[PDB]
Design a protein around this ligand. Structure first.
Ligand SMILES: CCCCCCCCO[C@@H]1O[C@H](CO)[C@@H](O)[C@H](O)[C@H]1O
Ligand SMILES: CCCCCCCCO[C@@H]1O[C@H](CO)[C@@H](O)[C@H](O)[C@H]1O
Ligand SMILES: CCCCCCCCO[C@@H]1O[C@H](CO)[C@@H](O)[C@H](O)[C@H]1O
Ligand SMILES: CCCCCCCCO[C@@H]1O[C@H](CO)[C@@H](O)[C@H](O)[C@H]1O
Ligand SMILES: CCCCCCCCO[C@@H]1O[C@H](CO)[C@@H](O)[C@H](O)[C@H]1O
Ligand SMILES: CCCCCCCCO[C@@H]1O[C@H](CO)[C@@H](O)[C@H](O)[C@H]1O
Ligand SMILES: CCCCCCCCO[C@@H]1O[C@H](CO)[C@@H](O)[C@H](O)[C@H]1O
Ligand SMILES: CCCCCCCCO[C@@H]1O[C@H](CO)[C@@H](O)[C@H](O)[C@H]1O
Lengths: 254, 254, 254, 254
């Protein structure tokens, strides 16, 4: 039932963001010690749990880029395309809100302690608690390239791991392995754009931050070209390229 | 045999606290390097081991909140409800005592080194070695909300992971995955209330600390409203809400 | 064939020490960043690998305390008892030697840099690279208690994990889980005595350190009562107590 | 089809280097916090993913030393030997290039910030981002010994883990376990030579660094004897010794 699938996608994506934005809020406003690998592994395992919870129902896309790619390469009913995306983005929105609710006091106290004007350019750092932003040394096109390449690897490997005709089937290991993949991607490329590779994961929370007092910098990141466009279309282009790559270079030889 | 189940629950919950309070004592009074994720993963894996050890006998509840929820939603014999809880809380008590025994010298030396009067408000930090306390910036109601939300996610996901009708069965992976779930919960929400989500895990050791010279602050946390009430009823309310949520939003669509 | 089993035990125990003493040498004389959990997880996974390699042949005891316990409670041929132990201790000896060989230069340079006289009381720290020593604040009897309690938990849980009549069988997961158990034990109790819980793991390398210029302090640890006696008999007493505990409190109710 | 196998090997080895060189670039020029175990576990899991992706096709050698050893001890068609190696080294080359592309700006900014002349002896540190180099305190022969011993353990354990006649078969766990093995090897021996143990993994990226402005020091490491020769032939000699060791000391007794 399509209604039960949209619900799962809503809970899955939200669950996913709950852990991700949560551990990052603890790092930013709670003074918790986290390394590049810790933040990555937590994001990865969060997604792994999000999958185990919703896989049996919606198939656990929990990613607009993934939904679109499966539609164009995995025979995924297009009628279910938009419903999924609207659910995925909605869950990411609510999750970010919920995480903000539990960390409410820590955000305000932190900003007062370090004289941070929420909404200003200098506040983009705490805004990074919800969505991704470009590294200081790279630009729009560079950031678009990174998100594209990584999402391709994500989609490409997801298919490989889920492809039962590829080596010994992983069975119940697939979800966990997909989480570890996300872990290593965020540890090797994270410093560049925050390994968004999920339109819903970035736009949803971004919209929340925008409402939560961060204003326009939540979308722009304090740059000339509105940054939100990168985590929005970058993952999509990559998810397709990656999906195509697997089918040709690997699938065709199985 | 109910007697053999209460024993398992006693050993399981104790084993669980042994690792948890143990790694936290090493962090607090042993000067060991631990990050928010390390402490969380150790707690998670400790519970994972506690499950593998007692699952085959008592079903491995090792959590009053869980026992009650299974009673109201998993057809768990109510006659076994109180016996379990009394065993779970007892094990947590003994474990905390045992951990204190092995770390005896380190506690006293630490307090002398940093002029800490055990029992005073400033000693709540070392008291945190046994039970959970609220973050400085949040209050009673806020702390109750956090514990409630997380325990709901705990119960909700536990059912999902153990639900054989939900995607590929995890089999022997279930326990480990439940531990990783606890890991990501403590890393994303830990800084707020110490992710207690287990009445026995918090009250048992709390009672020990109270006897061990920490006095009343072990229960109050140095606040107006006795804090021990949050980790006591907060998890219970959440465990039910979570259990209900899974049955409706997910189970009903499987 | 008993000869092929002693070889496996020799390679297993050695492999085990290779990773353990290796990561600890990198921490002590290589300036590598390791936390209490990292060192523990590396020791745990090293043992996990040591098991996968020798389990199919010798049964992978890789621990004198374990061999003795299996003899008294798992119907392990006593004729194979001494042969195993002599092999296990021999492997630990060679491994420690090999690790010292690869880290040769780093040890001498470190000692010169920090004016450390190998063999003196202050050199026990680098001697800790091979075997375990008591925490500054605890004494002989305290250290004996710690090693005893933990080894009991080790043996107790090993049986539980390997007991196919206890919940869902772990199959190929058993070894890994036994490694994670060792990981959480070393993270919760490590700071006290270095979680030796393996006579061969401590005595073998200790004898090497003694020959490598560390002298008598390698055995005494710079204390009144020769410390080597704790990691020697402490684990044995615990391995038995633990083995007994499982059979009674858990096995008898399966 | 040999063409489809060379492609897999090209993608596998590249994928492998993508994560490895990637996380190390984040550590060196992105200021990311990584410990000796984190870098090791990321390298290990990267290889684990590289295997799951290509195992079903090429058998996932992803290592010249491994290919040669399987040829001499696993009945691996020699006709496929060179094709594999040329593919493996090519993938490592491209991967290193790709990683450099995404981190382009960070490298130049870092060098300017810390006045580092790319190509000079002091630039070997950033060159370490792509290939391995010897620890300051050890020499050519010492470095050759280390790489040899570890690669032997790698090959030896790989066979053990993949040997279905050795204890309970690991099935879909094999790849992950091989990654964890690489993890513990890099954490115990890493500080000595960067646990290359893969001719393609070191030479490929080394050639890239050489073209990328690092010049001759990329091959020499700033030493008398050209260092690149160690990660080139060291792993090969060890891979054979290790392969032989397993067949004799373990295989012969199964
Ligand atoms: C789930 C529905 C959530 C709707 C958005 C709630 C956002 C609450 O966020 C609030 O936004 C205000 C407006 O900028 C700010 O002034 C406050 O500081 C901020 O707390
Ligand atoms: C499913 C996601 C669809 C996204 C469509 C584009 C939404 C763009 O969002 C817009 O960005 C502008 C630029 O900063 C802001 O000025 C506007 O307030 C904001 O609404
Ligand atoms: C398993 C049974 C344990 C019973 C409780 C033992 C507590 C020992 O704890 C002791 O408590 C004393 C009283 O406050 C303090 O004065 C001591 O400092 C403290 O070590
Ligand atoms: C199963 C757990 C039941 C718990 C029932 C409530 C126990 C409350 O405990 C009480 O808290 C008071 C307030 O700090 C203290 O003054 C008392 O000494 C203490 O006994
Ligand atoms: C595998 C067989 C190994 C035998 C022991 C070799 C120990 C080498 O160790 C050496 O011991 C000497 C004697 O104290 C010291 O003077 C040297 O500094 C030390 O390197
Ligand atoms: C299988 C292990 C058997 C160990 C038997 C006891 C070995 C004790 O070892 C002895 O310890 C003494 C005290 O420091 C030293 O003076 C001696 O040199 C040393 O040989
Ligand atoms: C995939 C094909 C890649 C071919 C090699 C590209 C190397 C680009 O690297 C460039 O090399 C130049 C020459 O040293 C340097 O001057 C530049 O600083 C460096 O960016
Ligand atoms: C498959 C790998 C084959 C490697 C063959 C040896 C390549 C050596 O490479 C050479 O090293 C010299 C010494 O620094 C440099 O001067 C040369 O520029 C370089 O081409």
């Amino acid at each position: 039932t399509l209604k039960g699938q949209c619900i799962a996608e809503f809970l899955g994506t939200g669950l996913l963001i709950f852990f991700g934005v949560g551990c990052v809020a603890a790092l930013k406003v709670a003074g918790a010690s986290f390394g590049q690998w810790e933040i990555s592994v937590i994001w990865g395992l969060g997604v792994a749990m999000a999958i185990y919870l919703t896989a049996g129902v919606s198939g656990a896309h929990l990613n607009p880029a993934v939904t679109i790619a499966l539609w164009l390469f995995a025979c995924f009913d297009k009628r279910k395309v938009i419903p999924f995306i609207v659910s995925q983005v909605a869950g990411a929105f609510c999750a970010a809100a919920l995480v903000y609710g539990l960390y409410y006091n820590l955000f305000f106290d932190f900003e007062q302690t370090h004289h941070i004007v929420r909404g200003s350019v200098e506040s983009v750092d705490l805004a990074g608690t919800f969505s991704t932003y470009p590294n200081p040394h790279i630009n729009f096109v560079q950031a678009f390239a990174v998100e594209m390449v990584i999402t391709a690897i994500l989609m490409g490997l997801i298919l490989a791991l889920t492809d039962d005709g590829n080596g010994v089937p992983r069975g119940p290991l697939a979800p966990l392995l997909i989480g570890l993949l996300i872990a290593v991607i965020g540890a090797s490329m994270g410093p560049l754009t925050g390994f968004a590779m999920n339109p819903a994961r970035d736009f949803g929370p971004k919209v929340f931050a925008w409402l939560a007092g961060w204003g326009n910098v939540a979308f722009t990141g304090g740059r000339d070209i509105p940054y939100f466009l990168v985590p929005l279309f970058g993952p999509i282009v990559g998810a397709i390229v990656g999906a195509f790559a697997y089918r040709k270079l690997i699938g065709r030889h199985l």
